[PDB]
Amino acid sequence: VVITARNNGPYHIKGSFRIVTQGGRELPVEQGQAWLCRCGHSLNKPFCDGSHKRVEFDSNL
Amino acid sequence: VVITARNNGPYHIKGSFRIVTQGGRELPVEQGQAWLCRCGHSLNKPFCDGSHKRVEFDSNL
Ligand code: FES
Ligand code: FES
Numbered sequence: 001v002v003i004t005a006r007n008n009g010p011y012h013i014k015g016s017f018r019i020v021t022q023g024g025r026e027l028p029v030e031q032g033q034a035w036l037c038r039c040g041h042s043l044n045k046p047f048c049d050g051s052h053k054r055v056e057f058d059s060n061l
Numbered sequence: 062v063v064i065t066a067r068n069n070g071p072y073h074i075k076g077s078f079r080i081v082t083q084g085g086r087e088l089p090v091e092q093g094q095a096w097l098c099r100c101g102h103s104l105n106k107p108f109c110d111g112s113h114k115r116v117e118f119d120s121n122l
Binding site: 001002003004005006007009011013015017018019020021022023025027035036037038040041045048050057058061 | 062063064065066067068072074076077078079080081082083084086088097098099100101102106115118120122
């Protein structure tokens with residue numbers, strides 16, 4: 001599994017992994033890839049929905 | 062690999078994985094486990110530094 005934190009962007013996850021809530025609810029992994037919100041403002045958490053551009057999330061690693 | 066998105070807090074990643082920048086730089090993973098900032102406010106991105114509590118991050122999944 002490789003996690004790429006995109007600059008000014010989401011975490012890109014690729015490989016064989018599961019996403020779960022603290023409660024234990026399985027969230028959907030499609031095609032062994034996901035983009036998870038890193039900016040805090042997605043309206044579809046934990047998935048990135050483009051909100052990072054709206055709030056000009058500034059994080060360059 | 063299991064990614065647990067903690068309520069009002071970081072992503073917990075457990076298992077065999079790497080973390081890389083979009084630039085290609087490997088980031089240091091301690092003992093098959095990391096907490097990655099979900100709130101957008103860590104001053105040590107991509108790692109959670111407890112800033113989620115300071116800015117009262119609200120995401121209960
Ligand atoms: S990183 Fe894309 S919506 Fe937050
Ligand atoms: S989730 Fe803990 S610092 Fe952002």
